[PDB]
Amino acid sequence: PQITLWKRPLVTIRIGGQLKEALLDTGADDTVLEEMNLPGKWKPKMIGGIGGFIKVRQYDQIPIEICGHKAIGTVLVGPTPVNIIGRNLLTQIGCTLNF
Amino acid sequence: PQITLWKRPLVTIRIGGQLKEALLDTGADDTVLEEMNLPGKWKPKMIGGIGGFIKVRQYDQIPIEICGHKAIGTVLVGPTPVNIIGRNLLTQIGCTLNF
Numbered sequence: 183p184q185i186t187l188w189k190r191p192l193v194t195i196r197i198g199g200q201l202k203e204a205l206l207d208t209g210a211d212d213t214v215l216e217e218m219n220l221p222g223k224w225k226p227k228m229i230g231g232i233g234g235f236i237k238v239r240q241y242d243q244i245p246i247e248i249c250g251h252k253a254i255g256t257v258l259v260g261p262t263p264v265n266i267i268g269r270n271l272l273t274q275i276g277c278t279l280n281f
Numbered sequence: 282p283q284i285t286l287w288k289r290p291l292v293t294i295r296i297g298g299q300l301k302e303a304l305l306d307t308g309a310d311d312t313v314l315e316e317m318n319l320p321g322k323w324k325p326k327m328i329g330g331i332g333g334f335i336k337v338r339q340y341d342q343i344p345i346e347i348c349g350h351k352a353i354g355t356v357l358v359g360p361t362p363v364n365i366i367g368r369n370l371l372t373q374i375g376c377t378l379n380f
């Protein structure tokens with residue numbers, strides 16, 4: 183598909199039994215999801231955004247389905263206001279910027 | 282051009298005769314540049330994202346040439362960690378997400 187940028191490029195993603203709306207975010211290195219209690223091992227991390235840093239939990243090799251496309255990779259979980267689909271997963275589903 | 286996302290989508294922009302590197306950011310509503318001098322009246326503004334809120338200066342109707350494509354629009358200036366081209370100007374240069 184082609185997504186214009188007149189509005190936030192929000193799409194439906196699925197992670198396990200949870201469906202959520204998330205930004206397709208070319209300015210995000212990583213995928214940052216709102217608080218959720220995912221299974222398995224994780225490591226603490228600090229990530230920096232526009233106003234400073236937040237603390238997140240890094241989970242590796244998490245399958246996520248984005249608009250019907252399969253992805254699997256690192257997901258950072260923490261107190262973000264918005265779910266962010268970062269470059270690590272955007273490349274997996276074939277996403278490019280075009281103009 | 283078509284831009285893939287294995288690297289940060291950083292491009293050269295021209296603003297006030299100065300060349301800067303800036304991030305093409307579909308996850309940004311607004312265009313926000315690191316501290317610099319621009320002419321004209323600005324309006325104090327606050328923006329909030331991951332990590333909290335910062336104070337910026339809003340300049341209107343500022344021309345930026347992004348990768349050879351001309352835009353004229355609102356540019357926020359402030360303590361952003363990185364120069365960011367947001368959706369207000371991405372739409373002007375015909376930028377879309379495709380996969």
Ligand SMILES: CC(C)[C@@H](C(=O)N[C@@H](Cc1ccccc1)C[C@H](O)[C@H](Cc1ccccc1)NC(=O)[C@@H]1CN(c2ccccc2)C(=O)O1)N1CCCNC1=O
Nearest residue numbers: 209210211212229230231232308309310328329330331362
């Ligand atoms: C850039 C501003 C203008 C924007 C905004 O903060 N958008 C964010 C997503 C976001 C977050 C919170 C609120 C609203 C949007 C998403 C952006 O793509 C934003 C751009 C950016 C990049 C680097 C440093 C600072 C900012 N990205 C990010 O903030 C995160 C940070 N992050 C990360 C960084 C290091 C290590 C691991 C992960 C990542 O992958 O994306 N914004 C804030 C004001 C309101 N609207 C808006 O678009």
